[model samples]
Target: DAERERAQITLASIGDGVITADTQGGISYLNPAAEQMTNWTLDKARGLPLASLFRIVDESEQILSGEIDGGREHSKLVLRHDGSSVPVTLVGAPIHRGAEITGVVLVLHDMTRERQYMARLSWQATHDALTGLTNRREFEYRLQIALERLERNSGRHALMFLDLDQFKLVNDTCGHAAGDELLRQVCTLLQQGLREGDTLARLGGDEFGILLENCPAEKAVEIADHLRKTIQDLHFTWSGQPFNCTVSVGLVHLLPGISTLEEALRSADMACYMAKEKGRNRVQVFHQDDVELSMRFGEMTWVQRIHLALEEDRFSLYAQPIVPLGEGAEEGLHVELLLRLRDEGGRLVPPLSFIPAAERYGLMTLIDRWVVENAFRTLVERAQDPRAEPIGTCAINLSGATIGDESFLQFLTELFARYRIPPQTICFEVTETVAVANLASAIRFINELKDTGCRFSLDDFCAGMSSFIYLKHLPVDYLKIDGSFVKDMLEDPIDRAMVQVINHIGHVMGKRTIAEFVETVEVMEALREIGIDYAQGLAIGAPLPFSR
Candidate 1:
């Protein structure tokens, strides 16, 4: 009797719910925890069917409704007498009386807390921490599924890349807090405009991806435009400053022909780029025949070409003379280093043909480095070679990407140490638009190099109407008049006026002025008459091998 009582106390004290049934499959006993779990006490539930008391539901959402098989184990839900249910894992074992099986015992483990933990973990894994939207990983997963569905002919879908046009300015100007606030607010605006079935995800910094399932092309465009307008209409205020932002949307249809995830993403990204290229705050759809996008596709091929060219040492340096307009035996050779690529067949490729691609794909920094390194070596070698004298001043073009690169400053310092050439003979050229766009970094770059006795020229100067305003702040020695103005100055009075103003301002600032595209005697004489300091054009001299 004492042993049986000890067993009873142990059973009642256990945390897991324990229920016992007789050979007839009627309830025989209930532990205190089981009574509370099922709301069926021994006295109230005795002789009732085990299924009626210990109701178990299956994965398919159905009640077992009969005796559960002994030795069966599963994670399921238990329906209580009070009509409420709790998640449970069920374990069953047969009860034996000496030699024969008498009943069965069921142990139910409540999984309420565990299930909640799993749900929270699942949510966090797929959602972005900052914007609380779908993240890139999960977005790509859904995109893959959508693509599969499209291939299976189940339905059509659309992918959209939404890039915030001025998001970087917000981060740069007001700080990261303002940038985060803008993204959060933009997330909400985009979510509100999207349909319930649509998936909105934060693909990356200031870039969002949208997946619309079972959406027609027309409907997708309409939805994308709606989202664009929503962001365009947002009037955000941060630190008492009012701001408005816009998005460039690139939409691509998930048709049967497109299968790979990379192609789909690339198409969407290219379309988005085209949108920004045409001008931001608009939507562009990807199509094979669009001339601009076709050009982008062609440029995409150049990325590989640039990489191969760099690897194979196929790039050659050329130089063109930048001479004083009224030259009478000037001091020494004043030439600009021009970069050209020799293709697999050894044909020369011009800079303009590949520079835009390099700039767009972030290869300019590498290309610029190659040009500088080679140019430095050429200058050093020429100086030592008695047969050919070194150029007096060599101008090297710098992309905006390099101007903003802080590490590039250290890179230049290292090159100077390595080459050990006179800094006075090297001049770096930055375009007006690039300098104006990256004013602070450009200033830092120019100031640091100028301190080392180097020179800078603002190439393509006065390309914009207000170019004169920034001239005073930039301590450049040469102002290269924009080529467009020089190319037509003899015919267009407006062009001539622009060229004259640029030259006058450049001289007033005590800076030398160089007119580009001086293609004829008439234009050269006109530039000389206007007192422009230097002229650079094919008519003056075509680019020749750097050694020559």
Candidate 2:
């Protein structure tokens, strides 16, 4: 009797709800926890069917009937008397008396906390935590669905790609905290302006997207323009500085032509870029008839090709000789390294074909780094080869972006020190126009490298005519006369005089002069007569594949 009393006390103190039923599956007793969980008292629940008092539903939302399975625990939602549900992992055991089944003991463990946690996790999966909008994954999923629906039933859908114009300015001037706060505030404004069913998403870093279901092209344009205006009017301030934020929007109608999700996104993105190019705070609808749009699309494709080329090791290096014009020139491989790319078909592509696109798309700095690193690597390999002839001077061209980049100087210094490169053996060529335009930066770059024993040549000298005035300030080892004057110097006296004056000034300034485009023997002779220190043209030496 004492042990029975102790068992009763244990049942009352237990955290899990405890219920007992007779062999008939009728409720025989209910502990305190069980009474509270089921909203029933032992006295009132007595003689009731256990299934009636302890109803449950499985994951499939089907109401479970009959006796609870013994020993094994199952996840189920228990139905209360008030029609509310509580999640539980329920376990049942047959109460036995000397090998005879008497009743059943059921334990119900509350799983409300775990269930809530999983619910929150599921919510987080489909939503952006920062702005509390639809994430890119969910947005893309819905976009795919929208496109599929349009294919099945001809319905209008639109996609808008929005790029914040001055978001980077705020992000740079302030910090990421300020940028995050700005994004949050901007997201709120964007949400407020959006329709109830429109799906707005943060497509990563200062870019946003909107999916409009059943929205016509005309209505989509109107909505995009209105949203642009709203963003344009936004006055954002961070750390005491005021900023006016604007957005460039690209709108695309999901017509039959825009069949796939990728096509819709690409068209929308291209249109957004066009909007940015046309000037920010504007909306540009994607249209096939626009010539500029087609050209930009072509360039965008080129950007992808450039990336593939870099990744696939399609770029090759060639060397063109810088032959000395003076008698018995001490030559041991004075050549400039030129970059070329190979098409998939094995045809060589000129730099002029892709360089302009690279420069326009801010890829010049990356390409410059690639060339410099490979150039240094090749130099190291050549030094290791006993049979290879030592290169006297290997010139590499520098773009305006590379010189302007502050980090590139460190990159160069690191490579020079690590490779223990013979700095005098490497020369960098800077265009005359780029040098004069960014005089101070160019001078600083040249001086730092010059201090490290490297050499510099001002390429296309007198092409801008401004280099002459800036020449005194620039520390350079060689001046390359512009090719236009060199190519026509024989036919045009003014060209000859230009070459003459450039050569004279270069010599007077204690710098060597190189005449470019010395294509014929006569041009070479004329260049030699003008006392040009070096000649670089087809006549001198055609560019050959650079190898160790």
Candidate 3:
């Protein structure tokens, strides 16, 4: 009896609540931990019915009954007390003597801390720690579960994969800290906009995953639209400046049990990639005919060839001349260099055709560095010729991976010093998306380069929400209007108005304005009329070799 009492005392002092009930569903034993958990005294709870003292619920939140006929052996359920349902792992075993049931012993182990620990562990393993959203692993698991449930229930589930359009620009321009803050804000907005049963997860690097259980294809589309609008409507201020952002969604619906989670995710990813290819900030659904074969083809195209191309200097430059505003085409002010891969036949392959593969294979940074070195070498050679006309400047595009490299700025400085070229002679142009997406690294690189008199240009301006807000923080000298706006200016009044506003804003902020896609004289005239300082496109003069 003394030994039994000592054991009882030990159980009472446990950190987690423990309770035991008799076969009649009466609480026969209450530990101090249990009383503390419910804010009740053991004396007051001793004779209470087990159901009255402890409530249980299932995953669906339905009340669970603990009643059993003839002394049950073992059962488990989550329990609640004091109006709070604590996740407690309960075990019930029959107290048998000589093959006859005398009573039942119930052990209640409060799982609140365990549940919290699991939640935290799961979150850490499957979520973006910076954003506090379900991560890739968690999303994939949930997607699999949803698909299995749909298969069993003959119901449908939808998957929506979202990519924040031009989030890179925010990170590249403002500083990564600012970008991180913006991402947190975005997560909060998305969480608030979602329905109770819906699941949202961050799939790394400005991508997000959402699961809609028991939802139809049409409802998924509606939700996608809502998500897009929510992103578009989001107005956030970072460091006292307001900005806007938008997201592109790729949605796929499981056809009852027809699709597996992997298939759905692959289709959704393909759809998202397509949306980006079709010009971001839009939504697209997976179509059986369009996605499967395309994904297969994409996978078949290897990165090995791209790496070989870089090794052999098979890549060449295609220059888009930056014409001076308002007459005087005598020598372009700046020429934006476009990269292309040359085949044995001397045919040039467009960047879009192989750049994605290169990026995937981690060859983009190498290629980008090669382009910069060659472009600068060509400029330096021309600048040194006594008879060659003075070239205003040449803008070389920078890739996200290259800019993010810790040694990139130092390498660039060394390269410039080696060539004896003034930093002002070269313009480093980065897309707003790249700048804003990794703002901290971008800012550090930009600041380091700026100190050396190197100029920076915000390329593809207006492609992202926070570009304008981040603009103030970036060490930039130029703003290149995105080609789409320039292309649509004549046909769309809103486009023209936007261009004018951007040009005005740039001028007000003491930045040079460059209008891209000046394919027609009328467009060039309009751009000049709108006070754009520089223009670049086919209509301006085709790229000539160093001698030409």
Candidate 4:
């Protein structure tokens, strides 16, 4: 009795499940682990068929024979009494008496945790963090292969670019968590329109990419239309308040014209922009000859125009005076020098058409250099001529690229040395976003130059939400209110309030406020009433040739 109890204790202590069967293939006994695994206690499992207690599929994916083979070990899945599947490795050893096999003992070790971990790894790599769609990396891998096949063999493939139109409002009003939930729901709804081979990716925030293999462009448009309508009809609610969000889709036929992935994305991305520009919740196709795109493209293609303009002396500097407006605030009259480039026809192109593109293409630092050289040269000429307009200080707009550039600082130092112009006679204007983005570098850059007598002004001061936070660190001289707010302030009460608030902040900080888009007498009168320090736009002065 003592020896039998020792065997029972040993079987109960082992982690692996063990069961013994009689010569008739009937289960005779089970350890505690076996009872736990099969949902059958030792007393109840006795005399039951082995198949009834522990059913299995073998390594070859075939159903196990009712009787154990009584030979080697093999990996298999156990179908427990509860109907849950478990990955396990089972070993069956034959019991022998007098050199004849009588019955078998089965031992099983569970592998459920290891198998689950590996499956989780496969899922995480391919899915997006926010929406559970295929992530950008995985989708691009599939896209590249599809495009390569399209190039080598003549087959139809269509790609679409989707941008959420109203997600910004949701993120802004309802909170980012609400935005994430909305995106997850949006992706699930979008998947309904796609056929089996279609692939969807979370390209970026509020932007998704789609690949429709072996699909014609026309059919792609139809699919996009269906998804667009489906999304528009969806009404989402957060915090018990319901709202609507829509998507703008751009579809492109991937073929001879769209050669590389970069070109395809650019074309497709711009097409989506067209949908937004035309109206929200629309679809557009890429047309190189598109009239709306022709103007936009001309602006971007002017990147080469910028390089050529610099080389051929086809660029000119223009300045608009910022006149003092209110009483007791008159300190000094200033003119902001603007940069312009000549098209192939030698027609002067405004900064509005080219600067955004220049900044995108890393040509801003080069452009900034051109402005400094011309502004300094003009200042020196005025100092010598003695008959020119007495310009107090020339303000030059600095691009974000230039503020972050180390070489640009050295170049400006060299230019100032060569020109022998007063550094106080120059003020470098940096927009609110540029300063905030490169705050550390900008602070160091501005202070280093300020020590040499140049000044800095925070342009577009009211553009960012926390515009005043930067004022403490930057020590800029002027706060130029963003033109959009100033131009619309008369019509928009919110804008009117913002202008007053920004003007107040600037005055409290001992910084002068300059109002932009001062295009009418009504606006000028309003600025004077609001105690604006200076004004710049067509009403006071238009940007003209800096010199004659």
Q: All candidates' lDDT scores?
A: 0.82, 0.81, 0.74, 0.78
TM-score to native of every candidate shown:
0.49, 0.47, 0.51, 0.51
The true-structure Cα RMSD of candidate 1 reads 27.3
Superposed Cα deviation of residue 71, candidate 3 (Å): 81
User: Which digits, one per residue and each the tens of the lDDT, describe model 2 over residues 144-188?
Assistant: 888775354466888999888866566435444566678898899
415-503 per-residue lDDT for model 3 (tens digits): 88777767887888888888977898888878887888888899978732246778888878999987767775776555677698789
Candidate 4: give its CA RMSD in angstroms.
Answer: 21.9
Model 3 clash number: 22
Which portions of model 3 show Cα errors greater than 4 Å? 1-157, 161-210, 215-303, 326-333, 463-465, 545-548
* Residue 419, model 1: Cα distance from true site in angstroms: 2.3
Q: Please tell me which predicted candidate would have the highest TM-score against the true structure.
A: 3
Most accurate candidate by lDDT = 1
Point out the worst 10-residue segment of candidate 1 by lDDT: 61-70
As a whole number from 0 to 100, the lDDT of residue 295 in candidate 2 is: 56
Candidate 1 residues 196-304, lDDT tens each? 8799999877999999988888999999999999999999887788888999999998864466899889889888877876768999988856825566565677677
What's the lDDT for candidate 1? 0.82
Ranking of all candidate structures by their lDDT, best first: 1, 2, 4, 3
Query: What does candidate 3 score on TM?
Result: 0.51
> Of models 3 and 4, which has the larger lDDT?
4
- On residues 279-314, what C-alpha lDDT tens digit does candidate 4 reach at each position? 779988777777245546645765667778888887
Please rank every candidate by TM-score, starting with the best.
Answer: 3, 4, 1, 2
